[PDB]
Amino acid sequence: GXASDPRCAWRC
């Protein structure tokens, strides 16, 4: 669940 965290959203 990364939809609110750009620094991980690239994976998810």
Burial code (b: 16+ CB inside 10 Å, e: under 16) for 1-12 equals eeeeeeeeeeee
The CA-CA-CA angle for residues 2, 7, 11, to 5°, reads 55
H or E element at residue 6: helix 6-9
- Identify the DSSP state of 5: -
The number of residues making up the chain comes to 12
Q: Would you state the structure tokens that stand for residue 12, as one six-digit string?
A: 């998810």
Tell me how the structure was determined.
NMR
Question: Measured between alpha carbons, how far apart are the two ends of the chain, in Å?
Answer: 7
